[model samples]
Target chain A: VEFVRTGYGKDMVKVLHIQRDGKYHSIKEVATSVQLTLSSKKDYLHGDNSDIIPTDTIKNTVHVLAKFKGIKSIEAFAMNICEHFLSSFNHVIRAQVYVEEVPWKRFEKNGVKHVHAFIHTPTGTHFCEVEQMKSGPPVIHSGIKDLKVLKTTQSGFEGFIKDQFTTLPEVKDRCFATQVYCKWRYHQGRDVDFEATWDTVRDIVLKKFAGPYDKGEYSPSVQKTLYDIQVLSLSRVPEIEDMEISLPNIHYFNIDMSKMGLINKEEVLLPLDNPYGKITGTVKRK
Target chain B: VEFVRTGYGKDMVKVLHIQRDGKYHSIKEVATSVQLTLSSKKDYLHGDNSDIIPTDTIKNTVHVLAKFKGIKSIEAFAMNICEHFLSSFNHVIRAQVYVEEVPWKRFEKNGVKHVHAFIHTPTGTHFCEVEQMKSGPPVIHSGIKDLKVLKTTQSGFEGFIKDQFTTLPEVKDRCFATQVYCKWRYHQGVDFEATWDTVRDIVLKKFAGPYDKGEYSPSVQKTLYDIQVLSLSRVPEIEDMEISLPNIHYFNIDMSKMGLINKEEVLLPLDNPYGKITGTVKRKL
Candidate 1:
């Protein structure tokens, strides 16, 4: 077999850093993975493993840096890892780091938020990827996963290609639910607040899904909604040049009460997990 | 390529069945999957879609059964699916079902539990698999996943093989943590409700080793072996068991570079490329 690709690093490295500020302490927890490409390929062809860096040492470096450097943001922390590997080893040509932040909010009792205690209220998870070459600037992209949302009304699916295999029927209005996955690209050499931009982009995506708070808008299909979200997010967040969204149609099938000799409406529905309709789109700014 | 093995089914069928008792209510939410093997291989030889059952219909059957027959437990629910396919269709030679129950607990406030409100407190996930042939009886296996546990002290690792490439230092005392994945087989037929809780309780008790006084865990391998031995002895209904424990490494930081003395109070937890220790224990017959 011919040697084609070669890269090595540590993956799923969970780092939980606690920042103490007198009595009030904050915590940043993330699962990170680092992949490095070396300048040489002697180990793959020959039986030489002398130049290979142990994954254990890369893990230790993450902990040591997290202790002294601190985790300001997942994007910045990933950059730290990439820069360290590129500068430390002469044989290392490129480094790429991926980080996913585990959501944790301060626990609230009565009305006040606690100082140390936290609750895992994962509305959604934030993730980012940073790729750095031997020289020049790094490429950064931020994304979100598992942002589940559901609407009871004002959603419908109609006017689709009907074939012999198609069993889905057209409905005027039905319940719509999806776990949204979105990723957007950042312009190079841009000074952006990663935290603030993330929150704003999240709010924009949610607002488009929900429409107006008092009077919600109608959704013709998941495809339309996906496009609208990207459009609004690109316009709202100036730093991001383009955005892509993927929404899985989590179907809620109406139960047939006629089998039991009873009239049925939309009151009883069964939420299905498998064989879902997937809709994805990408919108770029001109 | 010639046809050798054939099976069809739907996976990740999410079902949420609500049970109402006047003012009080409870919900059983589970993700189920069903796979069936037919007696005839004509469909594979020839391009025939008539004999093949649609996976969509399989998904619909799950909803119908979940609505009519309540989900008593994950094991029972899986058996219900297996029996349905085996009895409804003559061509079906074998049927297998898998179910995973999402953990949800009733919300309590001021010493009183809410009737309809529930909170997602995923302490651990309960799952089961049932396989039924055309004849005889169905074979059932139940398991647990993502049961995360951690102990602060009373754990140590020492006296290991050292070589030129070996950089890991042996320590007398350190932190022990792992996310456990365990599966056990049941003997013929059994009352799954009580047995599941008993097995889970045994695992927790053995890991922590009583209340205030904790057990000295020499290694994850030893602790896992102890749990498996006790589970097989306590639960007579179970025939054999398997357990996997990944050593979640949390190493202390060397703050000597910053001119600061390091203490054991703080540590860093790692996620990937962990040391995995797995063992299977069975009854000596």
Candidate 2:
């Protein structure tokens, strides 16, 4: 396996400021400080060490390049790092670039953008690009979370196998449980618009999943409902050629009270995390 | 992605025993209990309702089948569920069957072999099989986890980028952080033996990752190291494969003062549930 690596850590900051006691304080003045450490390495360990341009060197190059060429976006910051690794190493025919960018949002202090202090919301994106320069186009995959989505009124499941241990009451309606993880593959030439498409695709998918299905009637199944939502989303975007969805049937099994002399219908549900059934599929143009 | 509907809740039992305060009691005597309710619908809505079999039916089928056939192995149990779904749903061309077989162990209580209450240990294999009857031969992939592996010393990352805002100590040696989530694909026609071999492959891979690399190595650029170890362990039996490994990086930052900071001890570590590292590959005969 080939390799290149680098990362940033706290303490590399020349000046840092954090908010405390309703006031902004210099990082130096504060008891603790934060900084960003960036680095990269090309994995050339196989055929020749010459191509094994140390990831340390890649890290150094990123810092030097950033000083001269300030980056505007984490996506671009990652793209530049990828291009460097590909060009620098001779044996490095393919490179897998992984980037975890942390963001510092402005913390309101006296109605002004506090320069000395900012709220650290590690809310950022994880960008991965597998560039096989000698082969086909690079495969880019991005992901984001904490954007919680739930379908309180939509989604249902019925018409399945029944057996002896099967005590679950059949119903025409049930809640669909899933934390959406949607990915859209851009067309061959539309890679440049990834940043723009990210927001567009995310909102469209969320809205579709949250929106009612079956003409505001009953949701057939979470699997089918999610598929329809994805298909509908992809149809809205002509730029996207295909999309894949994975909706883990976060099974919210209803409580059974038949033996307890209680008529606990779908009123009570148990939310399970692990061991949940995962239903995944891809939606492509016919 | 094709759909493969399969589920398993529990099997037939005459009686369940519970132990409390060095005493045993039947499930009938116990006050609290747990049950699972599952339902799936794909057939009624879709024009081709054949494929849209109810999840409840699947659950019931699994239960009845378990009682009739008896679940000797999870892989076999999952195979039963997969075969039933494929045979029943004609429109269902391809199916991916996943089974999380609950692990139960028998313990010695008062020198008697009594099946102890279900133990909720992470130590269990997550069995997965992708059965596509449309194709000639079915594809089965099985994996297991909870194999705790750690190295207290001999790993470090020093060479890399440093910017004006960069602040990280360069160390010749330190600890590399990662938890093992290893899996191996078995050779066709031999699953039972292959499961054992793959489990061994997982352990061997963990051993190699810690021992083969130098005590003070920089970076997990050793994808080949992991690949070679796995390949060698399952040589001639397994062919080609893909591995998704995440190098969980743990950094020891400094912030010890007034005895709060012990020499080489006042290390402040930020626990990032998720961290980024390198994942690469190597292929061989």
Candidate 3:
């Protein structure tokens, strides 16, 4: 009969306010939702209210620390709070934190980046687990989510192990599309180059999925592509030992355009969410 | 034949037990997760044609594994697959798998909670996979996202010091609705299964409990704080957790222009574009 008490807090802010000689040149949006978890001392189990820290006070600690230390990178901010929790409370044993970067991409009004306006894109998440007794190490796990990419040609699927439940048709030169979710962890040893590592990994996965599929490259299947993406990433970035990428094939079926006297030729299609394909895997340097 | 490869995955992820006794029985999570994901090795990609594991094979693998291993816990189920993919294939680098619960609740046979029948809820998604080269003393992270919860009353907004550009009025009463997103990482040596289960219930319980009762408005900021506080106070197995709530404004319909007196009862609900008031709070050490 064990009951654990966990609290939640969430928010957003506009950072990346750029200035060129004082006048606003461009404002890159940086907004994120953060989540936190804490484990109280053992005495908290036995109706001990005195030792318990009000969850609100802890939340304020996040706000106070953010304001006190200044809002740096989401990683920096998280590192500060994680450090503070162990130092401040003797009753605390561990501090686990999850921070999601709610990405905002500068929209193009006519031909240039939107100076004052922006639209949101999912730029993945940045997380850290800093233990009280753990030292000299940074174990960071981050993810890029809802990154929707589609290739109209050069992607094909065939040669699947058929069983009674199998009914998918083998298609060559079919549309390949997926809203990918990716996470890569920096092997503990040195300090993490957070932004650079994140961007590089994301670019690798995107290119691996997009490069061959979007054009004249043949894709054997989603699983194959997902494997390649991670392989490419790990090889390119030796800093991280491995990466996990999830590609849920957001399906788009080609409409019968030829029947309507219009050449479909895989150029036109309908996107469907339900009954879609999902393929994911983690690739490591073997 | 227009064939779609969607199949059902079911389970009893947890069985919350009652006390007065030592060992615990169940509260029936006989709920399940519906999954469909693909797997392709490079051989299938470059036209070698021999090593492609069928997409259906993987789906069947989930079921077949369930039969062979029987369902233990979703975490164990996830772990089982993640380990197997790496062990099963020489070419396989990672087995990217996601197991999401198609949540459900026990039926109420009139008034009593039915022990057998259940209703579906957004049970949220749980996932994990292998990385042979990832590292020693594994770093495990998994979470629930976009969990939606709504409160009909006992919520309000007001009394925040404001500056220019703040158009939001301090309403004594307001509708609170937001898409909740939460993620938690397990300390390298912990199994998030139990902690994850407890956190979900705590988050649900806190949101429904201490609801800063009626007419008196405690801004969403405060509500956000309270929710976090509760989750942390309740759980010790895991360290920290946070939730993102996008505040939606269901504006009071002002019938003044129509020459009709307006009351707070009727409201205008706008879609797509609304007050994207977001609140996120967290605690850690």
Candidate 4:
């Protein structure tokens, strides 16, 4: 069996010279830096090779082009790369661009920051829209993983159905656990200030976890609370058209020892990893 | 938008015990050592409601069943729980069972082996599968993850189309890196075995990393090689198979300094963490 692959590859190159004590140093001196690499592949098998540029060529071209045309945001960088490839190679029918951005942090000394030495932290992952066809405007999608967040209070789930095996402790009080995976789409026909929008959304989302809920009573479900949080988050940036969130129900259940004649509830809770229920939703601000 | 949440409200019970000394102890001892939680949800927006059970009931039943019936392997334990729920409830058309076996390290005190307390380690994650359907045999998929393997010299990737911007140095010598994520299905009429022979053929295909030309010499074409290897490995085990593999690429480039170019030196090689290749293959073997 033969398969034909074609796509666009774009990498936005940025050069950083660490200035320590008024002197320029090599990249190593300023340890923290960021680089974005984006690529897309459009596959055409058999007779439909109408717009098929080889995926290998697309990969090679993206790296080379980055050296010549430096880009700013990962989203914009990927969009530009997609447009370039879609227009350049007629055989490239549909493309799927995957953008990855690496961020670096600089180490500091007494009064002067260390030159060339940097620390790498996995706080966020840069992402953008993957355009499969050329007829539509390129969309932007950004994401961050392992950005661990939790709430000690203001979360609960109740008023749901129950049956014979339904033994989930109906608590007016319980710890709500979740790992947030959120993806936001930028509105069309609007200029996106990538840096500013990202910072604002990140800060507001964290603050929402710290704040109170819509019911005036402390919130009961992290699900219900996040719905409002998402609305408020997108509201902060007018350019954001919609947002999608996946909250993995990282369950932390209280240990039961009544069978062992032990009633120490507050001291023990089991934090579960998988097989936990996942709650996901999307909010549109239209 | 009424939907049926079928997995919920099922009278299914299952528990996985991380035995002390890697051997089973009494259920009570295992019970005191860890936190136990149950998950159930109600979906009222889609599907037929005849099979829709309350999530809370499913949660309660799992606990009750665990109390009465002790669990063995996470695989068997989960399958039992799923079977109980689907058979007991007429509306419960489908159920998904999940189990996580916590890792407990074995230690020694005064030359006597002792089961030490649990600590989280990033090693292999043992997973079990049991999906119940209304009119078919229950589907079971089991696997492990984070099993890392690498070869410095034995692997190679030479047959690929080279293009205009192909400045990549062709190498007969280089380090090949990979983390193996393998899943094997039991033969159609056989039991799942812990032995390697039952699964080695697929493993060889994973190691083979096939391309269009039968088999590639090196499994290092970005992430494609890895997926190709995995696809070739598992496709023949059973009919209607699905596999996803991500191939990570790490490039080590030659350096130049002060009119002196060091070819194939081993320092300060730029890397892309997200530079990965991913693919899915489906076929009947």
Candidate 5:
């Protein structure tokens, strides 16, 4: 008979620490969800609860350890926890750790970013997962989620393979907005400055999404814009080996207003949340 | 034989209009999801797709009619949609239309609410549901979800019956935070428009220290009761108000090392696998 054992822990733990410079370089905002798995090469099918770790303890370990070591970047934090489970137990030969960071941005006053107070904006979240064994090199995967962005003008879709079941239209100019979610897998043997790399990639995505780089260039289709986004990021950040992105076309329709005795001039638009267009693709270094 | 018909439509459909003044009061940032069910005398079970309206068409009809009719209110919109399916076809014997409005706040700049732009926040959502038949009368139900709220000071939980399983400490200076979810069953004979506007406001008021003059919450149980009592007391349009709260645990801890005192000034906002406290209260008489 075959059997399995698994457990999970998750929490948004905020760690605060003051730097040696005397000012508080506090990581006062940290939101994380952690999950793990533990198993052995024996049969638990006969009902052996002796070797299992209570998930509550696993939940406690995430918090107490997080407090012990001040919050680092999401990937580094999950990696440390993953290492702990692998080294602490013998029968549990493997552990997989997953963490998601719910981010918050500080409010601006007088055009200055405030130091302490923050507003929880629904912009995006970052995540990472690492699988570790007692005596082997562990691989890592990580990514960002739900960066909702749009351009009110200067975005369009045209020139596509039109056949049966091609219900989409083609136009010279159109509105395009998507909740962009992207994740990446890194190659082994990289001493990465993950925090620095993360910030760099984030800025790159924004620039590619809205820069003069995007405004100057015409978006022939969603896939092309997506390819350019991944290409530019991978080109800039060499730590990443490949990237995958899911772009849900948050369809915003141009309202038919002329019949209502009114002129829209592309000012009025309709936004729908369901039955949306799904676009996804992956690109690796050639 | 027995049979049923159902479908759903979801998307962000923005609508626009003008105020009494010349400035355009446009809902340029709006997102909505709708679903429905219909049933009647059935011949459809015998491999009949003819009585079926494509779910995709239901999805499109919501947008097309919404743009053509313009945005009035969620309840009104669902009511109109319910009307179309029932009157336009005999296949639909009845319609239960559900509309969920994903909220967007009007960003204020220099004390002026912006005319168009909206930054999405996960604070809360509002929704309404209506049931209409080809005959007889229609009814409406509405509610809010994920309205997360907290008070750093002036909220506490203490004095509860305890046992061996009770690991919670009774403290007078504890923090209270909950993702509030509430729904209302409206009275059949009442002017509910006012109820819709003020019910949301009342929930906020209760959590923000109106329960017992905002002094202290002896127990979450008492607070739940007070919320129902308050609703029934203030808003009479609702037959009953049901409140669900998960007493989100923000465990207090101390960080004292090397003459530093981090005496629980900030509690860790945990992710999950914590003690989830749940309770519900309803009106009496």
Candidate 6:
């Protein structure tokens, strides 16, 4: 067997930076990882330790940088770390950094945000990655995962290939739920506002998924909904060159209440995570 | 290649059961999975689904049972599912069910619990599994995971084997943090409270690992040993147990290069590739 790829770095370096303005504190809690690729493979083929940088040292650098550099956005923080590794080491050919921003919301008191107290919103996680080479500009990808949402109506699935093994009955109106994973690529050499862009994309995706307030949008299938999300995202966000969205068809089955001598009104639904359909779509700016 | 073993079922069937008492409400939300083993292998060899129970049916049964049978506790709910499959199907030889209990706390106002509103505590997850055979009683394994804990001081590591690759420096006082994973088996026929609060209480108490303000932990290895021993000692219902603690290293940044002292207050907590230490304790004869 030949060793085709090798990279090593520190992972799960949790960084919580607090910015204080006269006792009013703002914080950013992130889990960051850095992996470096070297020009030589002597460490793997031969027992060589002289050219290697200790992973422990890399962990320390991440912490110190978080304290000094400050995290404006995960994308920017990742770029900073990637640039650092690429420039500091001569043998290091490439550096890739990933950061997952944990969600926290300050407590609300009488419509006012609390100064220090915060709560963790563990449902949704925002993450990003940046890769920088020795001579080229960095590439960045940002995304969100585990953003679970559901609608009681305005979704249906029909007109699918059916065979003997097929037991799923077609439904015109059903409860639709999914945990969405979405990622989009930013255009190179552009001065972009990463935070604002993230918020705008997220808002668009959620709004489209939920549809209008007065009337909900009709979704024929997860595939169609996923495609619509990507198309709209590309049209609205000029900073991103391309994007991909994955929606798992989290099934919520209608229970058969006839055995209990009751009429089923599609009210009680059972949500299952596995054995569900997965739909994905990717769109690029033409 | 010959197939040595085979089992199939549905996984990640999420169940949420809400209990009502007039205006006050209580809820239990769990993700459950069921797997079954059959006595015959006709389906695998001959593509015969004649005696096969559709995985869809299994998924539906889990949800229907959750609504009708009720999920008093994850352990009890698992046992109920296992019992159903073993009794309902003659071709099935064994059935096993696994469940994960999600945490939520009811809203409070004026120190009174609210009737409806609730918030999810995503930190710790409680889980359990039950296995039942054709002619024997069910065996149960219960555990908790992703329970992150940390103490600022009173943790240390020292006096270890040193070699050419030894880079970790010995420290007497340092921050100790770990995401704990503990699993224990129950003694058959013991009257046990299926709710995880009691067992969780014992674990946290031992893990305060002060354990009482008079003693400090020398290493994660010793701490895990103490926890297993103490847990089995306190809870007689448990027959044997194992605990795994990954040493989440938090290195204090030396800022002297920038002309400042870190004072051990500011530290970095790492996420992956942690130093793992695990141990199992059983009742002595």
Model 1 chain B: which ten-residue window has the lowest total lDDT? Answer: B253-262
Candidate 3, residue A182: how far the Cα is off, in Å: 0.8
Off by over 4 Å in 3: A1-21, A25-46, A106-118, A121-136, A212-216, A256-268, A284-286, B1-285
- lDDT scores of the candidates, listed in order: 0.85, 0.50, 0.58, 0.53, 0.67, 0.84
lDDT of 3 by residue, A1-286 (tens): 6666554334543234343434435433344333444465344446656655565676667667655675535666666766776667655555555555556666786787754566765544433333223333435666677677777777888887876545566887777888878877666674667778778877787777767433555777888888888878878777776688788887788765553456665666777655677787876555
Deviating ranges (above 4 Å) for candidate 6: A109-111, B1-285
Per-residue C-alpha lDDT of model 6 across residues B1-285, encoded as one tens digit per residue: 676767899999997899999998999899989999998888988998987889999999999889888987788889989998889999888899999988877987789998988998866678998999897899998988889988878788999997655667898998878888988888875434443566677667666744458257897888787777777777777888889988888889777756668868888665544689998888861
lDDT of 5 at B107: 81
Cα lDDT for residue B263, candidate 5: 57
How well does candidate 1 score on lDDT at residue B18?
Answer: 92
Show pairs that collide, candidate 6: A12-B270, A12-B271
Off by over 4 Å in 5: A1-25, A41-44, A107-115, A164-167, A213-215, A262-265, B1-285
RMSD over all Cα atoms, model 4 = 31.4
* RMSD to truth, every model: 30.0, 32.3, 29.6, 31.4, 30.6, 29.1
Candidate 5 structure quality by residue, lDDT tens digits, B1-285: 433454544445433332333553555233455454445323334655666677677777777778766556777777777778777877676676666665666788689887656666657677777877677567777777778888765666667788644666777777778887777766666444456557767767767765555756666666667776777778766767667877776766444433446657857665443444444445555
Better of 1 and 4 by lDDT: 1
Go through the candidates in order and give the clash count of each. Answer: 2, 38, 43, 36, 14, 2
* Tens-digit lDDT track of model 5 for A207-265: 66666853455666778778887999889878788889888888778776665566776
lDDT of 2 by residue, B1-285 (tens): 454453322333222223344544312111111122223444333545443445456556665666665555545655665666566655555544555433344455677755434344344444444454533355555554444444545656677787644456678665555544444454564555365455546544543454556334455555425554565355544543444444554455333422244445434333434344433233344
Per-residue lDDT tens digits of candidate 4, residues B1-285?
Answer: 543432233322334443344553433211211111122232344444443445566666666666556555555655666777667755555666765544444444587654444345435445555666754566666555564444444455565577654545566655555555544444344333352233434444554444333343354443444443444454344322223344445455334323446544553322334234343344432
Candidate 4 per-residue lDDT over residues A191-248, each given as its tens digit: 7788678767766666665573443246666676668668888777888888887767
